[PDB]
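Ticket 4471: requesting a sanity check on a complex prediction with BO2. Repro inputs:
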Amino acid sequence: IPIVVAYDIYSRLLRERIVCVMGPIDDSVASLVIAQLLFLQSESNKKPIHMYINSPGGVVTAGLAIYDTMQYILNPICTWCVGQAASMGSLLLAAGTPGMRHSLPNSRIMIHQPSGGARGQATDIAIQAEEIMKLKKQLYNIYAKHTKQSLQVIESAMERDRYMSPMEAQEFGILDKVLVHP
Amino acid sequence: IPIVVAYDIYSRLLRERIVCVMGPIDDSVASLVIAQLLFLQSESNKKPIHMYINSPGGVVTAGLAIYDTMQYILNPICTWCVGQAASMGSLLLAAGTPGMRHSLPNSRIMIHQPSGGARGQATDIAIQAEEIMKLKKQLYNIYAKHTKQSLQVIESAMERDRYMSPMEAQEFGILDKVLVHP
Amino acid sequence: IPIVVAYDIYSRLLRERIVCVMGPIDDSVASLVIAQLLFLQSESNKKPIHMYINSPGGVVTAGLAIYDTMQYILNPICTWCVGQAASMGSLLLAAGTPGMRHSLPNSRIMIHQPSGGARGQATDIAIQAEEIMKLKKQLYNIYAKHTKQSLQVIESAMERDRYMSPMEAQEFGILDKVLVHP
Amino acid sequence: IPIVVAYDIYSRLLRERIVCVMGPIDDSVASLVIAQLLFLQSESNKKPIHMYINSPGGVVTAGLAIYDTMQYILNPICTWCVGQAASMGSLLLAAGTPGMRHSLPNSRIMIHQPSGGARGQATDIAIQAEEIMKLKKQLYNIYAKHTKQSLQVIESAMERDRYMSPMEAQEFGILDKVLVHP
Amino acid sequence: IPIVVAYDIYSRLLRERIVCVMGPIDDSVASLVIAQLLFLQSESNKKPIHMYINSPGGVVTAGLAIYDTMQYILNPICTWCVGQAASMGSLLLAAGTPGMRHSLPNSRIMIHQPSGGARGQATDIAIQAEEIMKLKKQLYNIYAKHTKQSLQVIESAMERDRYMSPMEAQEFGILDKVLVHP
Amino acid sequence: IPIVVAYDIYSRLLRERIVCVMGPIDDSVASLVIAQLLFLQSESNKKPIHMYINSPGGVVTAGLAIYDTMQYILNPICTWCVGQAASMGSLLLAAGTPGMRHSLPNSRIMIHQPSGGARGQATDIAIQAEEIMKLKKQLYNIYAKHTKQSLQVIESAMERDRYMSPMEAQEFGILDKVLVHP
Amino acid sequence: IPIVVAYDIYSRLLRERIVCVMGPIDDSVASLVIAQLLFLQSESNKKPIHMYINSPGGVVTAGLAIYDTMQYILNPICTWCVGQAASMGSLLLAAGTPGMRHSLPNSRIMIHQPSGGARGQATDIAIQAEEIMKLKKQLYNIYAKHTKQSLQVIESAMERDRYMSPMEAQEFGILDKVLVHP
Amino acid sequence: IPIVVAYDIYSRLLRERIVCVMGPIDDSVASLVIAQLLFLQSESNKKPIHMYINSPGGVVTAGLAIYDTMQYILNPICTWCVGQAASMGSLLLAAGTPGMRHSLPNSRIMIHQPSGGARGQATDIAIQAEEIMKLKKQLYNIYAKHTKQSLQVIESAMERDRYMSPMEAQEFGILDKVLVHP
Amino acid sequence: IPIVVAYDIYSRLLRERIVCVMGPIDDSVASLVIAQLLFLQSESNKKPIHMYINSPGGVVTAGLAIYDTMQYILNPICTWCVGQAASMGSLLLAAGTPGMRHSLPNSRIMIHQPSGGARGQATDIAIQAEEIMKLKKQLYNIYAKHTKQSLQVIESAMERDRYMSPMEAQEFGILDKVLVHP
Ligand SMILES: *[B]([O])([O])[C]([C][C]([C])[C])[N]C(=O)[C]([C]C1=[C][C]=[C][C]=[C]1)[N]C(=O)C1=[C]N=[C][C]=N1
Ligand SMILES: *[B]([O])([O])[C]([C][C]([C])[C])[N]C(=O)[C]([C]C1=[C][C]=[C][C]=[C]1)[N]C(=O)C1=[C]N=[C][C]=N1
Ligand SMILES: *[B]([O])([O])[C]([C][C]([C])[C])[N]C(=O)[C]([C]C1=[C][C]=[C][C]=[C]1)[N]C(=O)C1=[C]N=[C][C]=N1
Ligand SMILES: *[B]([O])([O])[C]([C][C]([C])[C])[N]C(=O)[C]([C]C1=[C][C]=[C][C]=[C]1)[N]C(=O)C1=[C]N=[C][C]=N1
Ligand SMILES: *[B]([O])([O])[C]([C][C]([C])[C])[N]C(=O)[C]([C]C1=[C][C]=[C][C]=[C]1)[N]C(=O)C1=[C]N=[C][C]=N1
Ligand SMILES: *[B]([O])([O])[C]([C][C]([C])[C])[N]C(=O)[C]([C]C1=[C][C]=[C][C]=[C]1)[N]C(=O)C1=[C]N=[C][C]=N1
Ligand SMILES: *[B]([O])([O])[C]([C][C]([C])[C])[N]C(=O)[C]([C]C1=[C][C]=[C][C]=[C]1)[N]C(=O)C1=[C]N=[C][C]=N1
Ligand SMILES: *[B]([O])([O])[C]([C][C]([C])[C])[N]C(=O)[C]([C]C1=[C][C]=[C][C]=[C]1)[N]C(=O)C1=[C]N=[C][C]=N1
Ligand SMILES: *[B]([O])([O])[C]([C][C]([C])[C])[N]C(=O)[C]([C]C1=[C][C]=[C][C]=[C]1)[N]C(=O)C1=[C]N=[C][C]=N1
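Returned C-alpha cells:
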C-alpha cells in the first residue's frame, strides 16, 4: 500500500468522505465498513458520503448489517458501481438514496435467490428450512421496496441467475444514471 | 475365512438355510442378502429361513429393500438378535413372522428417528426437506404395523435415542422370546 | 461372496436368467450388463429375462448403451424396482416391455434433467453447450416415447427434482403393477 | 485497517466510549473486551458505555467472564444488535441495563441449549456429564433473571433451536426497542 | 498361510475342534468365531470344543455376542490362555465350563473397567452416560457370576488397571489349573 | 466378474469370436486386444471377427498398433458402435472392412485433432513440434483413406471438436448402416 | 522495499504522477490502481499521468474497471510498455490518449480471445454460455474502437494466440511510437 | 489490539499495576509475567499488584517459576478469578496474600493430580516415574500450605477431577471473598 | 512363492517337520508358528522338529507364547541360527533342547534389556512401571535357567547392547555347536 507523507491511500480517500466496498463481503469487511460509516457520521451528519462497490457477493447477515447501518444514519449516500455488483453488491447498489445511484458504462449486474444448507435430524432440518424460506421472503421485500417493482416480478426474475447491463438495470429500477464523464 | 473340504464357513451355513446380516447395511450388503434370499426361495418355498442380526444401522433404501424382499417371499422367516440391533437393524428384527423373533440375553436394542442433509438453492432445500419428512412418516407407519403400538407412542418414543434390554423390547412389541438355552 | 458347490451367487442367479443392475452406472457396469445380455440371448432368443434395479444414477453414455442393447435383442424383458430407481435408473425401469414393469411397495422413484460442465475458450464452450442441449432433447424424447405423456408435460415435470411413490409412478406411466406377494 | 492522523478506526471509536464485539467469542476476544471495559471505567465511572454486537456464539467461560465484568462495573451499559446474536451474543444482548437494549430492524436472534463432549473411563464420563448439567442450570437461571420469564418457559423454548425477529424478541423480553432512525 | 494337501492350517485345526481367538476383537472376528461355533455344534452337540485365547481386548458388543453364543450351545468348552488375556479376553477365559480353564506358565492377565465417549447436546450426553453406566453394571454382574467373588470386591479391584500372574488369577477365580506339560 | 461353469463372461464371448474394446485405450489394452486378435487368427483365418467399441479415446501409438494389427490379419472384421466413439475409437470404428461398420441408434461420434506437449531447450522443442506435426499429417491421411473424403474437408472438419449422430456419421463416411433390430 | 528519508520508492514515484501496473491483474490490484488514479485527479485535473505496464493478464472485471476509470477522469494519460503486455495489459496499453502510447524496443505484445467455464444443470450452462459470448462481443467492440480496425479483422486476428513486436503492434494500431532514448 | 495515543491496552493497564495471566501457561507466558513482575517491583516495592487469572492450566515448571517469583518479591499481591481457574491456574489463585483472593460470581474452579509420560529402557522408565512421583508430592505440599487443609484431605480430593463454585472454593480455603460489585 | 506340483515351498518344507521363524515377531507370526507346532505334535509326538531362526526381535507376549508352546509339547526341538538372532530371537535359540542348538559360522547374536513406555496420570504411570519391572525380572529368570549363568552375570551383561559371534555365544551358554558342513 502506497503512503502519502503520513497516510495510506485509503485513509487519504476517507479524508474525502469516500468508502470502498471491494471483494467478498464477510463479517470483518462489514465491521470495518460500519466503523467507517459511524466515524463519518460523527464528523458531520449533513454531508454526503460516497460508496464505491466492486463485489461478487457474500454472507447475508453481514450485508443486512451494512444495509441497516446505511438506512440508519442521517447523511445522504451515493453509490457507484465500478466493475461488478452481484448478490449483496446489487442489494447495496440499489440501497442508496433516490437520484444518487450511478454505474460506469462497462459494468455487469447480477441478481439471483439465496442458497444454503441443512444437516442433522429431521426436526432440525425442518427448522432450518423454515428459517431460510423466511429469509428469502425478507430479501424479496427489500428488493421490491427499493426497485418499485411488484413482488410477482421480483419472484419471476430471481428463480435463476439474471445478468444485466447498466441500461437494463436502469430500466429495472436498480440505478438512476449511467455516466461517461464528470 | 476357514474352509471345509470345498466350502467356506458362510456357504456351509447357507447350506443350512442360515443368512448372516452383520456390520453396517449398505447397497452391497443389501444386494448380497437379497440374492441369498432369492436363491433360498428357489430351492424351496415352504422351509423356514433363519436370519442372524448384528448391526449398528445403515442406509434407508438398502434396509427398505431388504424388508420388502422379506415380506415378498412365501417362506417363514425367523430373526435372531446376537449382540446389537440398532437403527435399521432394529427394523429388521421386528419384521420377522409373528412368534419367531428371538434375542440372546445380553443384547442391546436401540430406536431413534432418521437423519440427513440438504444443500443448494432454497427451492432445492424445500424439496429435500419434504422428501425426508415423508420418509419419516413411512418408517413410523412400518414400526406401528409390526409392534402393535399406536402412532402417538411411536412418535413420542423416537424423538431421542432410546435404548432397551431384551425384556423391555419384548414388552414394547419388538420381540417374542428371550432364550438362554436350545 | 458366498459360493454354491462351484458357482458364486450371481452366476447361480444368472443360470435362472436374472441380471442385477446395482449401484452407480459407469462403463464397467455397462460392459458387464451388455455381456450378460448378449450371452443370455445366445442361449435362447425366446425366453424372458428379468432385470433387478437398485441404482442412484450414473453416466449418460453407459445408460444409453444399456438401453439400446435392451431394445436390440429379441427377448422380452421384465424390470423390477427394489429400493431405488433414480436418474438413469428410472430411465431403465420404464424401458421394459409393456405389461412387465414392476416395483416393490416401499420404493422411491426420482426424475430430473441432466447436468454437466464446460471449460476452455469461448468457441469450445459454445460447442459443448450445444452438445448438452441436444442430449437433453434426446433424453426427453425417449421418456415421452415410453411413458405416453406429452413433451410439454415431460419438460414441466423435470425442471427440478421430482420424487414419486410406486402409485404415483404408475399413474405417470413409468410402471404397470405394484406387487405385494408372488 | 484505516488510520486517522495517529489512530486506528477502532481506537478512534473507543475514544467515543464504543466497544465492538464481533465474530466468534473466545479467550482472546474476552480478554480484549474486559481490558477495554476496565480502561473505560478507569476514565470515568458515571458515563454510559455502548456495546455493538454481531456474533454467532462461542465458548461458555469467555462469555460468562464478559457478562460478570459487565455486571461488576458501575457504568450504565447500552447494547446494540446489528446483524446477528446467537448463543452468547443473545445472552450478552439481554444483559444490558433495563431500557437500554436496542436492535436494528433486519436482525436475527437465536436461542438454544449448550453442547459439549465427554471421554475416558466411566467415572470420568459421569463427572463430566454432571458438570455440563450444572452449567445448563446456571445458564437457564441467568436467562430467567434477565428476561422475566418463568423457568418452565425457558426450558420449553430452548430444547431446540429457536429463531426470532426483533419484534418477537421484544415480546419475549430480550429487547426493549426496535429503532429505524436516530 | 501354509497348506496341507487341500486345507489351510486353521481349517486343519478346526477339523480337530479347535477355535482360535487371536488379536483384537471386533465384529468380523466375532462373526467368524460364532459361525465356527455353530458349525461345530452342528457336527456334534456332545463333544468338547477347545478355544485358544491371545487377545488384548476389543469392543463390548462383539465380546458379549461371543460370550452369549458360548453359553447358548450345549457342548462343553475348554479355554486355554496362551500369552495374553486382557479386557474381553479375560472375560472369555473365565467363561469356560468349570474345571476346564487353563493357562500357560508365563501368561499375563489384566482386568479393568470400560471406557467410552459422549458428544452432542446436554440431553444426548445424559442419555449416553446412563447407557455406559448400566453397561458397566452388567459387565460387573457377569464377572461376579463366573469368579464367585462378591460385587464389592469386583468393584474395588477394577477401578484401575490390575495385572495378574496365572497363580494370582487362579486364586482370584478366573482359572482352575496352571499346566507345564501334557 | 460372473463365471459360467469354468469360464468368465469375456472368455465365453471370445469363444464366439467377439472382442471388446471398452474404456480408455493404453498399452495394456492394446496388448490384450492384439493378443486376442492373433489367437483368433490362429484358430481360423477365414471366419469373421466382431469388435464392440465403447471408448473415449487414448494414446496414439496404442491405437495405431491396434489399427495396424487389424489391417494385417486376413479375417474380415465387423465393428459395432455401442454408446461412444471418440478419438481412436472413431478411428477404429472406421477401420472395419467396407460394408461391415454398424452403430446403435443412440450413439455419439466425435472427431478432433491430436494434442501433446513439449519441454526443454529450444532445439528439443523444435524437434518435438516437428514430430507432432508429422503425426497429425499421418492421422489425417488414414482418415481420408477410410472415409473417401478429400484432405481439405478432413482438415476443415477437425480444427475444433465435432460431434455427430449415427446418420450424420453415415453421411460423412465413417459408417455403413444404423440398425434397430437383428 | 527501499525507503527515501520518509517515503517508499513507489510513493516517491507517485509524487511524480507515476502509477505502476505490474504482475497479474486481480481485484486488489484494480482497487489500488483506481484509488491512486482518483487521488491524482484530486490533486490536479489538468496534469498528465504516466502508467507503466508489465503484466501477463488477469480477470476481465478488474481490467474493465481500470479501463472505465481511465476513460472517466479528465487528465491525459500516457502508457508505457516495459517488458510484457498480454490480455488486459494489451487492452490497457491501447486505451491511452492518442499520440501518447509508447513501448520499449524489446517488448512483446500478445492478443487472444477470452476463456472461462460453466457448470451445473443444462439451463445454468446455457445462461453462462450466453453471458461469456456477450462478454466477448463487448471486448471486441472496445478493441475495434481503440485500434481503428474493422470488426472482421479483430475477430480474424484473435481466434488463436497472436504475438507482436513493437513495430508490428504500431502498424496494427495498438501503439504510436517506439522509443530508444529520451 | 487497540491503542491509546501512544500505548496499547495492556501497557495502559500495566501503568495501573495490573498483570494479565490469560490462556494456557507455557515458557513464553511465564517469562513475560516474570519480567512484568520484576519491572513492577523495580518501580516500587510497597505498592500492591493485581493479577487477573483466566487459564485452563499448563506446564508445571512454568507455573512453579511464576509461583516462586510471586513469593519472592516484597509487594502484596491480589488475585482475581474471572471465568476459569483450572489446574495450574487454581494453584496461582490460592497463592495470593491472605485476605486478597477474589472471584467473580459465575466462575469455575477445578483441581486434579498431574499427568505425564515415560519412554525408553526399563531403567529410564524407573527414573522418570520416580521424578513424577516426587513432583506430585511437592505440589500437594504447596496446596496444603496455602489452603490450610490436611495432606490426607488434599490427596483424597485430587484422585479425580474436582469442580467447584466460588462458595465451595471459599469453604475449601482457595478463596477469601466472592464479590458482586466494587 | 514357487510351487511344487500342488504345494508351496513352505508347505513342502513343513512336510519334512521344518518350521521357519523369519522377520519381526508379532501376534500373526506367533499364531502361525503355534498352529504349525500343534499340527506337528498331532502328527507324531516322538519325532524331532527343526526350527530355523532369522529374526531381529519383536513383542514380548508373542515370543513368550512361542516359548511356552515350545516347552509344552513333548517332541524334541532343534534350533538353527541362520543370519541373525537378536532380542526375542536370541531367547528362542537358547530355548531348544540341550545338545540341539546350532549356528552357522557367520551369524551374529545380540542380547539386551526390554523397552517400553508409560502415559497418563501418576497412578497409572506407577502401575505401568511396576509391570515392566516384573517383566524384566521374569525374562532374566528364563535366561538364567537356560544359559546356566548366575543372575548377577545376566544383569551385568544386559545393561547395554551386547553382540556376540557363535564362539562367544557358545562360551556364554546360548549354543552347543558351530557347524561348517553336514
Ligand atoms: B450471493 O451469492 O452472494 C448470495 C446473496 C443474495 C441472494 C443476496 N449469497 C447467499 O445467499 C449466501 C451464500 C453463502 C452461503 C454460505 C456462506 C457464505 C455465503 N447465503 C448465506 O449467507 C446464507 C446464510 N444463512 C442461511 C442461508 N444463506
Ligand atoms: B439408522 O442409523 O440405521 C437410520 C435408520 C432408522 C431411522 C430406521 N439411518 C438413517 O437415518 C440414515 C443415516 C445415513 C445418512 C447418510 C448416509 C448413510 C446413513 N439416513 C439415510 O440413509 C437417509 C437417506 N436419504 C435421506 C435421509 N436419510
Ligand atoms: B442421473 O444422475 O443418472 C443423470 C441422467 C438422467 C438425466 C437420465 N446423469 C447425468 O446427467 C450425468 C451426471 C454426471 C456427470 C459427470 C459424470 C458422471 C455423471 N451426466 C453425464 O454423464 C453427462 C455426460 N456428458 C455430458 C453431460 N452430462
Ligand atoms: B453457542 O452455540 O455458541 C453455545 C452457547 C449457548 C448455549 C449460551 N455454545 C456452547 O454451548 C459451547 C459450544 C462449544 C463447544 C466447544 C468449544 C467451543 C464452543 N459450549 C462450550 O463452550 C462448553 C464448554 N464446556 C462444557 C460444555 N460446553
Ligand atoms: B478393553 O479395553 O478391551 C475393554 C473391555 C473390558 C472392560 C471388558 N474395552 C472397552 O471398554 C471398549 C473400548 C473401546 C471403545 C471404542 C472402540 C473400541 C473399544 N468399550 C466399548 O466398546 C464401548 C462401547 N460402547 C460404549 C462404551 N464402550
Ligand atoms: B483423443 O483425445 O483420444 C486423441 C486422439 C485422436 C486425435 C486420434 N488423443 C490424443 O491426441 C493423445 C492425447 C494424449 C496425450 C498424452 C497422453 C495420453 C493421451 N495424444 C497422444 O497420445 C500423443 C502422443 N505423442 C505425441 C502427441 N500426442
Ligand atoms: B488473459 O489471459 O488475461 C485474458 C483476457 C483477455 C481476453 C482480455 N483473460 C481472460 O479471459 C480471463 C481468464 C481468467 C479466468 C478465470 C479466472 C481468472 C482469469 N477470463 C475471465 O476473467 C472471465 C471471467 N468471467 C467469465 C469469463 N472469463
Ligand atoms: B494442569 O493441567 O495445569 C496440570 C498441573 C496441576 C496438577 C498443578 N498440568 C500438568 O500436570 C502438566 C500436563 C502437561 C504435560 C505435558 C505438556 C504440557 C502439560 N504436566 C507437566 O507439565 C509435567 C511435566 N513434567 C513431568 C510431568 N508432568
Ligand atoms: B526385542 O527387541 O525382541 C525385545 C525383547 C527382549 C528383551 C527379550 N523386545 C522388547 O523389549 C519389546 C519392544 C517393543 C515395544 C513396543 C512394541 C513392540 C516391541 N517390548 C515389548 O513388547 C513390551 C511390551 N509390554 C511392555 C513392555 N515392553
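Notes from triage: The CA atoms of residues 63 and 170 of chain A lie 22 Å apart. Leaving this open until the requester confirms.
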